[PDB]
Structure 1
Amino acid sequence: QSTLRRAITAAYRRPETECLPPLVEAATQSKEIRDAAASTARKLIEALRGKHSGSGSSGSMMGEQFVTGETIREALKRSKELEEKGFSYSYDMLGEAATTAADAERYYRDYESAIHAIGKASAGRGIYEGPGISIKLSALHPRYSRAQAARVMGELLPRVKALALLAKNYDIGLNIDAEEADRLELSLDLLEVLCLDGDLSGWNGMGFVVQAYGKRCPFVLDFIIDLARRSGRRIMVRLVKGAYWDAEIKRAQLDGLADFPVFTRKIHTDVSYIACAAKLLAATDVVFPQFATHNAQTLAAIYHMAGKDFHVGKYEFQCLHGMGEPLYEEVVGRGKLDRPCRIYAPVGTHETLLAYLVRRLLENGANSSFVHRINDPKVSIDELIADPVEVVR
């Protein structure tokens, strides 16, 4: 318990109207930055609309567009082409929400075998230039959402620590994906224990996702930035909007709550994301920000907010396999923006793919999504480059 932890708990269901003013202020950019971001965003979107990206490119319900390979060996082999273009990878062994001990055990073995393969393929490239892995805590505990948080974390900790130690041995990144809002606190407690565990000293590969659609986002970030500074671990922080919005709304509508744990207007999430990006960019000494987005306006805003100084390891962008390549082909490389992007790369069979595909459908099919609007003949470029702070009303 701390003042920083108290701010997280206090924001859980803070009224949406009260959350917004501080985010609006922090997300407000100077005129020069806004003008430069508009120019960059226009250039990117014109390039995108000469392509055929977005929801129209999502492929068939077989989900072939979204999976990098069936096995880690297959996915690693297929990664060489984009790696020399300036992309990196974070591999996701598909599988989540284990319901039996056998399933949780299988997912653990999958993650463990992937770390060995990824770590050997990394070949000493380290946590920024080389590949990493992403895990879901719900894969590793058979009653992750339906058991007491204290006991869940206590059985989960040895498994996650063992995986982190393997990642340290090979010096690769290991990211904890963010899932449902009611599990933020548990996963954050796990992150704290790991960052204070002396067995993991000298390794900066521990990573953690924070969801900007959540009202707690800036306060989670303050806690993580402070944890990094005091632990000496340069935590990799993946800033995302969030993948479970429809489910969070449905659960909140059934819990009879007046105030949800997530925002309810998409523009509020966009303001939240930019405000939280400003917080992360002011903390690159102690954290490694990873800006996961397919929205060219969001990207261009962050690109200019970061300033002129850049080196590999300062920050990166990220995208999902099968969704982000058209945009980021206009970003990576010395002929573009010369900023790196890490591809989140699902690995598994068609069975383990289904739950992930449903979230990709809700993301690609929503009229509010950038990837849908980029292909919408009714949506102008002027609208696509609008600054969320200047639009909110």
Structure 2
Amino acid sequence: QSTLRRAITAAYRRPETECLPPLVEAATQSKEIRDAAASTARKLIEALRGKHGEQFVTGETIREALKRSKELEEKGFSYSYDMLGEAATTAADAERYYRDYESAIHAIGKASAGRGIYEGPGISIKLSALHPRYSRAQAARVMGELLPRVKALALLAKNYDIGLNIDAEEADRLELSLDLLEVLCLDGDLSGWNGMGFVVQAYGKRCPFVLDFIIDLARRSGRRIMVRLVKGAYWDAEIKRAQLDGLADFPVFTRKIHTDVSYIACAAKLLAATDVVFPQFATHNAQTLAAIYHMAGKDFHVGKYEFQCLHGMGEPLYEEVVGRGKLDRPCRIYAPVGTHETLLAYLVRRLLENGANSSFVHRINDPKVSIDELIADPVEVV
């Protein structure tokens, strides 16, 4: 319990109208940056509009996925591999997912061949795959059996010097996963390894306060935490859970423009802290990308920050970003690995993403949507 942790708990269901003023202020950029980002975003979108579930899986096995990664790695992309599987319901399921993560780390770490955590591939895990009652069991007990398993995987990732990222899932599990992150970052057995990563979801009202906590945790622990900033994949489920809960105040925003403002405000916070964290800006939205690209300034080196995208979704955009003929910024591809069976839940989230009229990836193909609208700055519209 600390002041920084208390700010997280207090924001859980803070009224949406009270959350926004600090985010609007933090997301307000200078005119020069807004004009430059509008220019870059227009160029990216004009390139995109000149362009156009097997498409979402990189390979059935990690051996297959590693082989298919060589082409894009020489173009300037990196990878984070996702062994598909989540929401384990039995001990045997959780055990199989653990062994899949373990064998993937060995294969990825050997494939990395000393490239390190920024140039080389990493892995992403879901805590719900590793505990059989993750969402339906008491938080303290879950962390007690979960911690040995995650620490063991982190130690393997440290052995090979690869990244290991904890994906973010439902809002009611943020606190648990955050407690696990702190324990690992203070664990002396993992010293000297900067590969521990953590996702934060900008559609959550707690997002800026989680980031404050993580930035301070990195500074005091000496671990350069990899922080993947996403908007959030579970919006429809969080709304439906909240409506059943009968609460007037949800843990997430209810207007897409509020999430957009929150993302930019949180990106500003992360870019001001690149000494102690490694920001990873996961988005397919060209306006969001352009804003962050200019927010970050003229100084860049590999390891300062990176972009990220999903396999099968982000390559048309990020082919206009990676490489010396483009923006010369790196992008890490999130790469699902597994069978069609384990793919289903991920596919459903991709459908809610790709099929929503509010999504950038749908609007880019919508004849009713002008380029002028696609490059609108969310602060100026909110």
Identical pairs, percent: 100
CA distance in 1 between counterparts of 2:144 and 2:49 reads 50
CA distance in 2 between counterparts of 1:362 and 1:240 reads 15
1:59 matched to which residue of 2? none
The answer to whether residue 290 in structure 2 is matched with residue 300 in structure 1 is yes
The answer to whether residue 7 in structure 2 is matched with residue 17 in structure 1 is no
Moved >3 Å (runs of 4+): none
Deviation of residue 171 (structure 1)? Answer: 0.1
The answer to whether residue 132 in structure 2 is matched with residue 142 in structure 1 is yes
CA distance in 1 between counterparts of 2:155 and 2:365 reads 44
CA distance in 1 between counterparts of 2:283 and 2:378 reads 15
**1:143-197 deviation digits (Å, cap 9, x = unpaired):** 0000000000000000000000000000000000000000000000000000000
Deviation of residue 376 (structure 1)? Answer: 0.1
The answer to whether residue 365 in structure 2 is matched with residue 375 in structure 1 is yes
**1:264-300 deviation digits (Å, cap 9, x = unpaired):** 0000000000000000000000000000000000000
Deviation of residue 317 (structure 1)? Answer: 0.1
1:58 matched to which residue of 2? none
Deviation of residue 212 (structure 1)? Answer: 0.1
SS at match of 1:70: coil
Deviation of residue 130 (structure 1)? Answer: 0.1
**1:194-236 deviation digits (Å, cap 9, x = unpaired):** 0000000000000000000000000000000000000000000
**1:310-364 deviation digits (Å, cap 9, x = unpaired):** 0000000000000000000000000000000000000000000000000000000
SS at match of 1:376: coil
CA distance in 2 between counterparts of 1:301 and 1:32 reads 11
Deviation of residue 94 (structure 1)? Answer: 0.1
CA distance in 1 between counterparts of 2:342 and 2:290 reads 34
1:210 to 180, 187, 200: 200
Deviation of residue 251 (structure 1)? Answer: 0.3
Q: How many residues get paired?
A: 382
CA distance in 2 between counterparts of 1:243 and 1:66 reads 15
CA distance in 2 between counterparts of 1:178 and 1:141 reads 15
Deviation of residue 3 (structure 1)? Answer: 0.1
CA distance in 2 between counterparts of 1:13 and 1:360 reads 27
Deviation of residue 368 (structure 1)? Answer: 0.2
CA distance in 1 between counterparts of 2:208 and 2:140 reads 24
SS at match of 1:207: strand
SS at match of 1:319: strand
Deviation of residue 111 (structure 1)? Answer: 0.1
**1:69-92 deviation digits (Å, cap 9, x = unpaired):** 000000000000000000000000
**1:57-116 deviation digits (Å, cap 9, x = unpaired):** xxxxxx011000000000000000000000000000000000000000000000000000
SS at match of 1:49: helix
SS at match of 1:91: strand
CA distance in 2 between counterparts of 1:19 and 1:140 reads 33
CA distance in 2 between counterparts of 1:257 and 1:105 reads 36
SS at match of 1:84: helix
**1:29-57 deviation digits (Å, cap 9, x = unpaired):** 000000000000000000000000xxxxx
CA distance in 2 between counterparts of 1:148 and 1:129 reads 38
Q: How does 1:254-265 map to 2 (within 5 A)?
A: 254-265=244-255
Q: How does 1:212-291 map to 2 (within 5 A)?
A: 212-291=202-281
Deviation of residue 141 (structure 1)? Answer: 0.1
Deviation of residue 366 (structure 1)? Answer: 0.2
CA distance in 2 between counterparts of 1:181 and 1:73 reads 33
CA distance in 2 between counterparts of 1:300 and 1:154 reads 42
1:27 matched to which residue of 2? 27
Deviation of residue 131 (structure 1)? Answer: 0.1
CA distance in 1 between counterparts of 2:347 and 2:80 reads 18
* Consecutive unaligned residues in structure 1, runs of 5 or more: 53-62
1:163 matched to which residue of 2? 153
CA distance in 2 between counterparts of 1:183 and 1:277 reads 23
SS at match of 2:9: helix
* Consecutive unaligned residues in structure 2, runs of 5 or more: none
CA distance in 1 between counterparts of 2:139 and 2:349 reads 25
CA distance in 1 between counterparts of 2:91 and 2:347 reads 24
CA distance in 2 between counterparts of 1:69 and 1:155 reads 31
Deviation of residue 255 (structure 1)? Answer: 0.3
CA distance in 2 between counterparts of 1:147 and 1:307 reads 45
Q: How does 1:149-188 map to 2 (within 5 A)?
A: 149-188=139-178
TM-score, structure 2 length as denominator? 1.00
TM-score, structure 1 length as denominator? 0.97
Deviation of residue 383 (structure 1)? Answer: 0.1
SS at match of 1:371: helix
CA distance in 1 between counterparts of 2:92 and 2:150 reads 17
SS at match of 2:307: strand
